[PDB]
Amino acid sequence: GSITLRGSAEIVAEFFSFGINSILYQRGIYPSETFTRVQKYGLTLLVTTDLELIKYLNNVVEQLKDWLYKCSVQKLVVVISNIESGEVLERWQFDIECDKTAKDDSAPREKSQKAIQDEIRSVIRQITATVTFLPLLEVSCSFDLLIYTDKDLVVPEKWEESGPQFITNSEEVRLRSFTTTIHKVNS
């Protein structure tokens, strides 16, 4: 599924986190009864407080909040595979798009573009929509987050040679492998 999590430096950071936390809440190959109801983007939203997976997204969210660019860079690919069904299984691909670039007269105010409410609401809607339609499944699987850029981000080892890489294998945590990679792209 290819989607576009665009908006603005701040809205983008949130767009990805909420969209990413959604895949976990909707799919969650091994979440916990700790979700949280949050009302934003003009509607209600759900998220997980799993510190473990959060620790992973937390470090990435920090880099996302300020990797080291300010122009292009804006592509992501989530790779999830079923370790107990048929290998690959789900792939949430979402790109980003920054508009109205600027720095002066910043100020913490702007109001997310109406399209953000509809665009972001439609995202969480399609994720949670299939979930209910899903025959309550999960099994053990692998999870990897990718960040595709456009010749505008040379994240050095500052991350970890390629984002973190956690793994699992407990007869209850399902899941099996978790990772995050920064991919580079040209036009």
Residue 16 DSSP SS3: helix
With contact defined as beta carbons under 8 Å apart, do 12 and 110 qualify? no
Question: How many Cβ atoms sit within 10 Å of the Cβ of residue 24?
Answer: 22
Residue 169 DSSP SS3: coil
Instruction: Show me where the domains of the chain are located.
Output: 1-187
| Tally of CA atoms within 13 A in the half-sphere of 89 that contains its CB | 20
Determine the Cα–Cα distance for residues 178 and 129; give it in Å rounded to an integer. 24
What is the CATH architecture of 1-187?
Answer: 2-Layer Sandwich (3.30)
Q: How far is CA 172 from CA 32, 77, 150, 175, 185, in A?
A: 11, 26, 40, 9, 38
Q: How far is CA 29 from CA 24, 134, 173, in A?
A: 7, 13, 8
Determine the Cα–Cα distance for residues 163 and 128; give it in Å rounded to an integer. 27
| Residue partners of 156: CB distance under 8 A and separation at least 6 | none
Q: How far is CA 132 from CA 84, 120, 137, in A?
A: 21, 19, 11
Task: Find, among 156, 167, 13, the residue nearest to 76 by Cα.
Answer: 13
Q: How was this structure determined?
A: NMR
